Design a protein around this ligand. Structure first.
Ligand SMILES: CCCCCCCCCCCCCCCCCC(=O)OC[C@H](COP(=O)(O)OCCN)OC(=O)CCCCCCCCCCCCCCCCC
Ligand SMILES: CCCCCCCCCCCCO[C@H]1O[C@H](CO)[C@@H](O[C@H]2O[C@@H](CO)[C@H](O)[C@H](O)[C@@H]2O)[C@H](O)[C@H]1O
Lengths: 179, 93
């Protein structure tokens, strides 16, 4: 893999999250009920600014950091980032259990979101429609979506491991009489 | 002499800006409709500038001649209350 730049992305992410807080502040000031003005935007707003900034900071910082600590690109990183984000959002309610719950469940949802590829879109070339499928023809390596009538035994022993009934050679032939 | 008629399009742009702000700020809506008529005229001007006077005239005889006649024909007959432009009410936006 190629490492991430933690502070460069975190500074961009914070300015972005500050901008989103400004937009949501203005939109609330317009959509709200009672007498207001241009002052109320950052006074009477329910923490939209600190919500957005703390989330974007914590998410991107944790994803890039754990991508660099684990030294990989995968879904476990998005899980840790959603765990931080849940901590931040749940710290607003000043309770321990809801803080722990917000953390775990935001983390599981972002961790699933990284499992499925960390995108709401689709790859469109790793998909089944645009990829080889069906029966492989002649002894060729079995890809993901391909089907096979008879699998190699060496590949089985490697993917699984030996023992628990599963062996390099069958049991009868292994114990056949040399006759 | 030549360049006296060089910036007419920019003038119409500035004037359309003005008429939009005036439609938005006017107290009595009837005035806002008059400014809409000013805007349709400026559009007809600009269309003449770029070589389509036929649409300038079709606009003046459709929009102004019928639609705006009707808008005045409505606001003359209905009790359309208002709330004059303010600072307590609209600054928040
Ligand atoms: C200015 C400088 C710019 C700097 C550059 C970078 C800027 C980036 C800005 C990012 C966009 C920020 C926009 C913020 C959202 C709009 C603010 C908002 O308030 O939205 C809700 C809005 C009003 O709600 P409100 O008055 O606050 O009352 C709340 C009580 N429920 O009520 C609404 O109905 C509007 C909702 C708008 C929603 C937009 C579409 C969002 C899509 C949802 C994503 C879902 C995907 C995830 C799903 C995961 C599934 C588990
Ligand atoms: C709860 C059950 C239902 C949940 C919904 C999800 C079910 C669908 C299965 C998701 C399949 C995802 O699979 C996706 O990743 C696999 C690797 O693992 C990729 O498979 C490809 O990986 C590359 C390595 O990167 C290798 O060359 C491999 O031989 C293959 O070509 C495909 O690009 C894609 O198919």
């Amino acid at each position: 893999f190629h490492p991430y730049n933690t502070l460069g992305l975190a500074t961009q992410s914070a300015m972005v999250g500050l901008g989103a807080g400004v937009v949501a502040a203005a939109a609330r000031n317009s959509l709200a009920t009672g007498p207001r003005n241009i002052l109320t935007t950052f006074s009477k707003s329910g923490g939209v600014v600190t919500i957005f900034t703390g989330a974007s900071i914590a998410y991107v910082f944790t994803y890039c950091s754990a991508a660099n600590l684990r030294e990989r690109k995968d879904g476990w990183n998005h899980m840790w980032a959603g765990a931080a984000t849940g901590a931040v959002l749940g710290a607003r309610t000043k309770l321990v259990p809801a803080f722990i719950g917000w953390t775990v469940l935001c983390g599981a949802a972002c961790g699933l979101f990284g499992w499925t590829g960390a995108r709401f879109n689709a790859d469109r070339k790793a998909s089944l429609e645009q990829s080889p499928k069906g029966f492989v023809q002649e002894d060729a390596h079995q890809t993901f979506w391909e089907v096979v009538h008879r699998r190699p035994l060496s590949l089985t022993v490697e993917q699984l491991g030996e023992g628990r009934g599963i062996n390099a050679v069958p049991i009868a032939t292994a114990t056949e009489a040399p006759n | 002499m030549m360049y006296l008629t060089y910036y007419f399009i920019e003038i119409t742009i500035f004037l359309a800006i003005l008429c939009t702000i005036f439609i938005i700020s006017a107290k009595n809506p009837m005035v806002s409709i008059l400014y809409m008529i000013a805007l349709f005229v400026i559009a007809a001007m600009y269309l003449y500038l770029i070589g389509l006077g036929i649409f300038s005239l079709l606009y003046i005889m459709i929009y102004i001649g019928a639609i705006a006649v009707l808008f005045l024909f409505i606001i003359t007959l209905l009790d359309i209350n208002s709330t004059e432009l303010s600072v307590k009410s609209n600054i928040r936006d």
